[PDB]
C-alpha cells in the first residue's frame, strides 16, 4: 500500500459558518424586491409574491446584494438582461471570500495549524472559473501548495450530501488526511427582476439566501486533541422516478436561471420512505439490532421549501419536533442551496451542547442527512452522533 | 464498518475512446480556419498562425464543428460576439453524447453488465448545466438510478489526473465498487475567430481538438474475469511556484476564453524534477529498493503543447523514446484537455500488446501520469503497469 489508509469512520471535527452581514427581513422583502426592481406597478404579481413570502417560513436572509449594489448595476434589477459577466465578476471573488470566513472559523475550532489540511473540497452553485473557487480559497487561506483540491461546480441543493459522500472516501482511504469541506453560495448569480411569465423564479426570490459552511473531516481523531461531532457511516444517491426536468438550472448570458416543472414536494415525499427504509436496512441488516424508528433518529434535511418539509414529515409520520433544527435554519437563513444542511448540522450540535443532551444529535445515536436537487437527485447520508460529556 | 472497503490497489479495468468523425488535417487548418472566419485579409496574422501550426506537432484533429455548422451559426465564426447560450445548447448535449460512445466501448471491453457500475465521475471543460453532464450520461447509458455521480466542471488540462486521484479513493474505499470515469471535451465552447490583440486564443486554435475517453476503475479485479491494465499507487497535486495567472480560462457571454500570461513551458520544466523526485521518494522510501531511473519508467504526460514536452524532456534528460506514446496522441488528436492523458494510456497499452512487450507500460513496471492546467496545477499519478502474458 504505497499510500496508507485510515481505520475509523470519517468524522466531522469542526464546523464553521459565515453569512453576508446585510440582513433582509422577509416582512420587508416584497417591498424591497419590487421597489429596487421597478415593478411596483405589477400589483397582482406583487401580491402573489407577498403570498409566497407569507408562506415561506423564512423570517430573514443574509444577502450580498444590497440596494446600493443593485442600484449601481441596473442589469441585475432587470428580468432578462445580459448579465453573466457582471454576475461572474462578483461571485468568482465573493464566493471564495465568504468561504474563507467559514473555513477560518472551522480551522480555529479544530485547533490544528492550517497546513495540516491535506485535501480541499469546494462546492458551489454560484459562478464558475479557471482556476476555480477551490484554488482561490487555497490562496486566501494560505493552504499548502500541495493540498489536493476538488471543485464541485453547478451542484445545486443536493451538494451538501455530495461533499460528505466524497469527503468520506478521501478521509477514510488516506491515513492522516484532514479534508477541508466548503460550501459557499451567493445569490448574485441568480437574482433577477420578477415576471408573470416564469413564476419559478419568483419562488426562488422568496427562498434563496446567501451563506457558506465549512467542515474539517477526518478519520481517527487524535484522542484528547481532536474532537469528533458526527461520523459518516453510509451514503447513497438516487434519481427519483418520474422526475425528469423537475428542477433545471441553466447558466445563461442572463445569469443562472431556475426552473421547476414538476411537483417537487410530491415527488420527494412519495419516494423518500422507500429510500430511507432501504438505507436503514443496509446499515442495520438482519442476519442483529432492528433499525431505530424515524422518531429515534436525528434529522438534517435540506429545506428546499416549507412544502417539502411539511409533506415529508406528513408522509413519514415524523413527530413535529424532528424537523425543528432544519426549520430553524430555514427560518433564519432561507435556502442557501448546498450549504444549508451543514448550517443545520451546526445548529443541531450547538443546541445539543447548549441543552446538555446526551449526544450531538439531540440525544439520538443515529441520524439522516438528506440533500435534494436537480435530477431529481436525493443524497442520503447516515450519520452517527457523538456522545456528549 | 457499515460500508466494507476494498483491499487491492485501484486498477484500470478497461479504456474506451471516441472522437467526432469530422477530421481536419493541420496542413489544411490555416486555410479552413481563416476562411470560415472571414479573416483571410489579415495576412500577417494568418502567417503567424501558419507558423504556429507548422510547429504544433499536430497532424490532424477531430472536431464536432464543421464548416456547415459554423456557417449556420455565424456568431461562432466571429471573435468576440455573444455566443454562450448557443455554445451551451451544443455542448450540454454533445459532450455527454461523445462520452456515451467512449463509455460504451469501455463497458464492452470490461465485459460486465452496465448495472455493475456503482460510481460515475464525469470531467469536462466544455459547458455546464444542472442536472449536469454526469446525469445526462447516466440517462444515455441507462445506468442504475442509484449510481453515485460526481461532475467535475471547468477543470481544464490537469483533469485527467484529478479524475484518477478521486477514482482511486472511491474504488479502494468501497468493496465491489466499479467507477465509470469519463472525460469529454468539445471545442465548440471556445472556438472563435482570430485577432491580433489576444494571440493566446490563436495557440488554442492550433492545438485544441475534440474527444472523450472512459475508464472502468476498480479494486480487487475478479480473477480470470476482469483484467487490470494499470494500477494507481500514489497521487499528488501541486501549485507550481511563481505561476499565478499562468493559465486562466473564463466562461463569458462570448463563451469560454483562454489566457496564457506566463512562460508555461518554462514554469513546468523548471519545477517538474523536484516534484517527481519527491513523489518517487514517497513511493520508494529508503529505510529498500532505490527508485527506478526516469528512463526505466513509462510516461503518460499531458501534451499541452510541443514546447512543454521538449522542455520537460530536455530538463529531465529523458531518452527520446520516453515521450513517444504521448507525442503520438498529440500528433493524431491534438490537445483534448482532460481526456488527452487517457488517450495516451490507451495508446500505450495497445502498443505494448501489439509489440508483445512484457508489461502494459512498454515493458516497464512503474510509470508516471502528469496533468498540467490552470493554477498552475500539476497532477502526478504514480502507476504500476500489469505484466503481459
Ligand atoms: O438556480 C439556482 C440558484 C442557486 C442558489 C441558491 C442560493 C444562492 O445563494 C446562490 C445560488 O441554487 C440552486 C439550487 C438548485 O438545486 C437548482 C438551481 O437552479 C439553483
Ligand atoms: O479554454 C480552454 C478550452 C478547453 C478545451 C480544450 C479542448 C476541447 O475540446 C474543449 C475545451 O481546454 C482548456 C484547458 C485549460 O487547462 C484551460 C483552458 O482555458 C481551456
Amino acid at each position: 500500500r504505497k499510500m496508507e489508509r485510515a481505520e475509523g469512520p470519517a468524522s466531522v471535527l469542526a464546523i464553521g459558518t459565515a453569512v453576508p452581514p446585510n440582513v433582509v427581513y422577509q416582512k420587508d422583502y416584497p417591498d424591497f424586491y419590487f421597489g429596487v426592481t421597478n415593478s411596483n406597478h405589477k400589483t397582482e404579481l406583487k401580491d402573489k409574491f407577498q403570498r409566497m413570502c407569507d408562506k415561506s417560513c423564512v423570517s430573514k436572509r443574509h444577502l450580498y446584494l444590497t440596494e446600493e449594489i443593485l442600484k449601481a448595476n441596473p442589469s441585475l434589477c432587470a428580468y432578462w438582461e445580459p448579465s453573466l459577466d457582471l454576475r461572474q465578476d462578483i461571485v468568482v471573488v465573493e464566493v471564495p471570500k465568504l468561504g474563507k470566513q467559514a473555513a477560518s472559523a472551522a480551522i480555529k475550532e479544530w485547533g490544528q495549524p492550517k497546513s495540516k489540511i491535506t485535501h480541499l473540497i469546494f462546492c458551489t452553485t454560484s459562478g464558475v472559473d479557471m482556476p476555480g473557487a477551490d484554488w482561490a480559497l487555497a490562496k486566501l487561506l494560505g493552504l499548502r501548495s500541495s493540498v489536493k483540491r476538488l471543485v464541485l461546480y453547478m451542484q445545486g441543493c443536493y451538494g451538501g450530501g455530495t461533499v460528505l459522500r466524497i469527503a468520506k472516501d478521501l478521509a477514510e482511504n488516506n491515513k492522516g488526511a484532514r479534508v477541508l469541506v466548503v460550501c459557499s453560495e451567493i445569490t448574485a448569480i441568480t437574482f433577477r427582476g420578477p415576471s408573470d411569465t416564469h413564476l419559478d423564479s419568483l419562488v426562488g426570490q422568496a427562498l434563496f439566501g446567501d451563506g457558506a459552511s465549512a467542515l474539517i473531516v477526518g478519520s481517527d481523531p487524535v484522542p484528547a486533541v481532536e474532537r469528533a461531532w458526527f461520523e459518516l457511516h453510509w451514503t447513497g444517491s438516487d434519481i427519483l422516478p418520474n422526475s425528469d426536468g423537475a428542477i433545471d438550472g441553466h447558466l445563461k448570458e442572463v445569469g443562472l436561471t431556475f426552473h421547476l416543472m414538476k411537483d417537487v414536494p410530491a415527488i420527494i415525499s412519495k419516494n423518500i420512505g422507500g429510500i430511507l427504509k432501504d438505507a436503514l436496512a443496509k446499515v442495520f441488516p438482519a442476519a442483529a439490532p432492528p433499525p431505530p424508528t424515524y422518531n429515534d433518529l436525528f434529522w438534517i434535511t435540506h429545506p428546499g421549501g416549507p412544502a417539502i418539509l411539511d409533506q415529508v414529515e406528513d408522509r413519514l409520520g415524523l413527530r413535529k419536533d424532528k424537523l425543528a433544527s432544519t426549520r430553524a435554519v430555514l427560518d433564519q437563513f432561507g435556502n442557501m442551496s448546498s450549504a444549508t444542511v451543514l448550517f443545520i448540522m451546526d445548529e443541531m450540535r450547538k443546541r445539543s451542547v447548549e441543552q446538555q443532551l446526551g449526544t450531538t444529535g439531540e440525544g439520538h445515536e443515529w441520524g439522516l442527512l438528506l440533500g435534494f436537487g436537480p435530477g431529481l437527485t436525493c443524497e442520503t447520508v447516515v450519520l452517527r452522533s457523538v456522545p456528549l460529556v
Side-chain angles (χ1 to χ4, degrees), chain A:
Chain A
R1 200 84 186 208
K2 302 281 185 192
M3 309 183 55
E4 287 191 77
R5 75 190 159 183
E7 289 304 302
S11 298
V12 173
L13 313 186
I15 308 168
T17 61
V19 287
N22 167 71
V23 177
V24 186
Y25 289 95
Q26 194 78 309
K27 68 172 152 85
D28 300 336
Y29 197 83
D31 281 340
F32 158 69
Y33 176 56
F34 272 70
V36 82
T37 200
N38 297 343
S39 304
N40 274 330
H41 60 114
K42 293 265 275 216
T43 179
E44 35 198 358
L45 187 67
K46 172 146 180 206
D47 300 312
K48 181 139 59 133
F49 178 72
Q50 182 76 51
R51 265 187 283 112
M52 300 175 342
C53 288
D54 294 348
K55 300 191 325 217
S56 65
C57 300
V58 182
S59 285
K60 65 165 179 63
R61 290 170 276 166
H62 301 243
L63 292 173
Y64 172 82
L65 287 182
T66 59
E67 190 184 281
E68 167 196 278
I69 292 174
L70 280 168
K71 282 289 201 36
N73 300 274
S75 66
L76 306 175
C77 306
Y79 165 73
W80 205 265
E81 252 203 68
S83 54
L84 177 70
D85 292 347
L86 165 75
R87 291 164 194 279
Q88 289 264 82
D89 289 351
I90 291 170
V91 295
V92 301
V93 172
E94 300 289 335
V95 162
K97 270 183 172 335
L98 184 66
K100 184 219 178 304
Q101 300 177 37
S104 288
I107 290 163
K108 186 241 55 161
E109 178 198 346
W110 182 36
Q112 296 295 316
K114 67 198 180 170
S115 58
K116 288 207 162 136
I117 294 168
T118 58
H119 299 247
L120 167 65
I121 302 175
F122 201 114
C123 172
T124 186
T125 321
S126 310
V128 297
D129 197 24
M130 305 181 61
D134 60 312
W135 179 87
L137 177 60
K139 284 295 196 233
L140 285 170
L141 287 176
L143 304 181
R144 63 169 77 165
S145 57
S146 61
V147 61
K148 297 172 175 198
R149 284 170 293 114
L150 184 64
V151 62
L152 299 195
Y153 274 141
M154 284 301 260
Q155 307 286 294
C157 293
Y158 61 78
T162 304
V163 301
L164 292 175
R165 169 158 56 80
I166 305 298
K168 161 172 156 37
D169 286 344
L170 300 188
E172 287 174 0
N173 202 45
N174 296 282
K175 175 176 185 60
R178 295 284 177 277
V179 183
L180 176 61
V181 178
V182 176
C183 300
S184 186
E185 307 284 12
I186 297 307
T187 45
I189 193 54
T190 196
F191 179 99
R192 61 194 67 256
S195 70
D196 49 272
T197 40
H198 283 263
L199 261 51
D200 311 41
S201 301
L202 258 199
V203 162
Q205 286 300 154
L207 291 168
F208 287 138
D210 296 4
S213 55
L215 319 174
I216 302 286
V217 175
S219 292
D220 305 320
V222 177
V225 174
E226 301 173 301
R227 174 167 192 183
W229 296 83
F230 296 97
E231 301 175 340
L232 322 183
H233 283 276
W234 187 93
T235 66
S237 177
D238 293 273
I239 300 171
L240 302 193
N242 293 123
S243 73
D244 210 314
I247 316 171
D248 291 349
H250 314 305
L251 188 65
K252 286 206 167 296
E253 307 170 19
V254 295
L256 180 60
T257 70
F258 168 68
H259 311 265
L260 297 164
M261 331 290 307
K262 290 188 163 58
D263 190 325
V264 170
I267 293 174
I268 293 175
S269 60
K270 322 273 202 126
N271 287 284
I272 191 57
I275 288 176
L276 298 189
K277 186 267 170 207
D278 173 75
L280 294 171
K282 301 278 183 202
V283 175
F284 306 94
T293 72
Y294 286 151
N295 287 337
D296 292 345
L297 297 173
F298 60 88
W299 290 77
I300 301 169
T301 310
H302 174 69
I308 298 179
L309 312 169
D310 291 344
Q311 285 183 219
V312 165
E313 163 189 81
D314 181 16
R315 170 78 50 184
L316 299 176
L318 305 185
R319 207 175 52 215
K320 194 69 193 195
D321 60 338
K322 302 311 295 169
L323 293 184
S325 286
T326 289
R327 295 171 156 137
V329 166
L330 176 60
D331 188 58
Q332 297 298 295
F333 302 100
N335 178 350
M336 298 171 292
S337 177
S338 68
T340 317
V341 290
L342 308 185
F343 274 77
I344 299 167
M345 183 181 281
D346 196 36
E347 170 80 18
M348 179 176 280
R349 74 168 180 154
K350 285 173 164 52
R351 292 176 164 214
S352 296
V353 169
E354 178 46 48
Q355 296 171 20
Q356 310 183 83
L357 304 182
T359 82
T360 52
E362 308 181 322
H364 308 284
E365 181 177 20
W366 296 95
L368 295 170
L369 177 155
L370 310 175
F372 318 112
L376 201 172
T377 303
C378 180
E379 295 279 345
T380 298
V381 185
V382 181
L383 311 167
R384 171 123 71 69
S385 66
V386 171
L388 291 176
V389 166

